[PDB]
């Protein structure tokens, strides 16, 4: 995250760290949606153009973390993956449309002060919060700058959702209804963005109606980090909810 701040302890208890077994490295962010399921971006796992094709056995999920590199004894929980599910129509050839995927944990994780799931939005929540100007929050241990360094602790930044047209007009990539973009306008004099290392992480919003946190987006793509006139694109969780339900019901939960 570029231009964010240190998160407070237990501030995003659904924040998950996708961790590479070997070499040991941070792959991307992710989010805990229940005791056995993690949500992330398909591209964090599969991206043929770069020869990226991660498997269950290649990864580790670390939950309840704060510090990026430390092994937080008695705080974090590390789990293994039972299965990975990528959206059958994720479009890695053209614009990462439907960049989403579910990971089923080998075993349910126990909630604690530092580990707790986020809610998935319903039609109405989506309808009310997913509006230009409304702000969401992104969190992650990704880079602090486009080229640079790296944070010690989880970072956070709040960003405004942007109108579709401005989104479209900011890039040459074909934008779909399964994405939304967010960030400040050059004009705004306020910066911030997700960056390398943050993908797959959650873009969340707090409902003013029921006080709960909802994940409306997944950090998906962007051209550079925090560049002027550029925005972050996120997977539209709600639009892809049916697929999410489908998978959790047909395979576990």
């Amino acid at each position: 995250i570029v231009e964010g701040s240190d998160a407070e302890i237990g501030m995003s208890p659904w924040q998950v760290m996708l961790f590479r077994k070997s070499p040991q490295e941070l792959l991307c962010g992710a989010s805990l949606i229940s005791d056995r399921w993690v949500l992330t971006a398909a591209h964090c796992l599969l991206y043929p153009p770069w020869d990226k094709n991660f498997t269950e056995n290649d990864l580790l999920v670390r939950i309840g973390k704060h510090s990026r590199t430390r092994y937080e004894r008695n705080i974090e929980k590390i789990s293994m993956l039972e299965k990975i599910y990528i959206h059958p129509r994720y479009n890695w050839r053209e614009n990462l449309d439907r960049d989403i995927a579910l990971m089923k944990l080998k075993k349910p994780v126990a909630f604690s002060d530092y580990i707790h799931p986020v809610c998935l939005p319903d039609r109405e929540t989506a309808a009310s919060l997913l509006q230009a100007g409304y702000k969401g929050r992104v969190t992650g241990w990704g880079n602090l700058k486009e080229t640079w360094g790296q944070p010690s602790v989880l970072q956070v930044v709040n960003l405004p959702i942007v109108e579709r047209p401005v989104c479209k007009d900011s890039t040459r990539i074909r934008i779909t209804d399964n994405m939304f973009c967010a960030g400040y306008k050059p004009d705004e004099g306020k910066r911030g963005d997700a960056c390398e290392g943050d993908s797959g992480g959650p873009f969340v919003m707090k409902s003013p109606f029921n006080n709960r946190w909802y994940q409306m987006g997944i950090v998906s793509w962007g051209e550079g980090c925090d560049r002027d006139g550029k925005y972050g694109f996120y997977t539209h969780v709600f639009r892809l909810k049916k697929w999410i339900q489908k998978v959790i019901d047909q395979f576990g939960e």
């Binding site: 077994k21 040991q24 490295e25 941070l26 580790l60 590199t69 430390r70 092994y71 590390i78 293994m80 790296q150």
Partner: peptide, 10 residues
């Protein structure tokens, strides 16, 4: 830069 995790997780 990553601190070692327990081998039970590997």
């Amino acid at each position: 830069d990553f601190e070692e995790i327990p081998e039970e997780y590997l």
